[PDB]
C-alpha cells in the first residue's frame, strides 16, 4: 500500500518538475514516496520519463531522501 510518484505525462530530459507532472499510485517496484511530491517541484530529471513511469531516486538531479 505504499504509494509512489508516477509520471502523469511524459517528462522531458533536463526539465523542471511541476505539480501537473506527478501523480500518486501504488506500483511495484516502489519508487520515490508520494509524500515527496512537494520536495520534487523545480528539481530536474536526468532522462526522459515516459507517461506512467515510476520516478526513482536516481532519475532526479539533486534528490536525496
From Swiss-Prot:
Name recorded for this polypeptide: Type-3 ice-structuring protein HPLC 12
GO cellular component: extracellular region
Expression (tissue specificity): Detected in blood serum (at protein level).
InterPro entries: AFP_Neu5c_C (IPR006190), AFP_Neu5c_C_sf (IPR036732), Antifreeze_III (IPR006013)
Residues marked Important for ice-binding (site): 9, 14, 18, 44
Role: Contributes to protect fish blood from freezing at subzero sea water temperatures. Lowers the blood freezing point. Binds to nascent ice crystals and prevents further growth.
Disulfide bond residue pairs: none
Cellular location(s): Secreted
Record's keyword terms, sorted: Antifreeze protein, Secreted
Family affiliation: Belongs to the type-III AFP family.
Domain AFP-like: residue ranges: 4-63
Superkingdom field: Eukaryota
The keyword Secreted is annotated on this UniProt entry: yes
Amino acid at each position: 500500500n505504499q504509494a509512489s510518484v508516477v509520471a502523469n505525462q511524459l517528462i522531458p530530459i533536463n526539465t523542471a518538475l511541476t505539480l501537473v507532472m506527478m501523480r500518486s499510485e501504488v506500483v511495484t517496484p516502489v519508487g520515490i514516496p508520494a509524500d515527496d511530491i512537494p520536495r520534487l517541484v523545480s528539481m530536474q530529471v536526468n532522462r526522459a520519463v515516459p507517461l506512467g513511469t515510476t520516478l526513482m531516486p536516481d532519475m532526479v538531479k539533486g534528490y536525496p531522501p
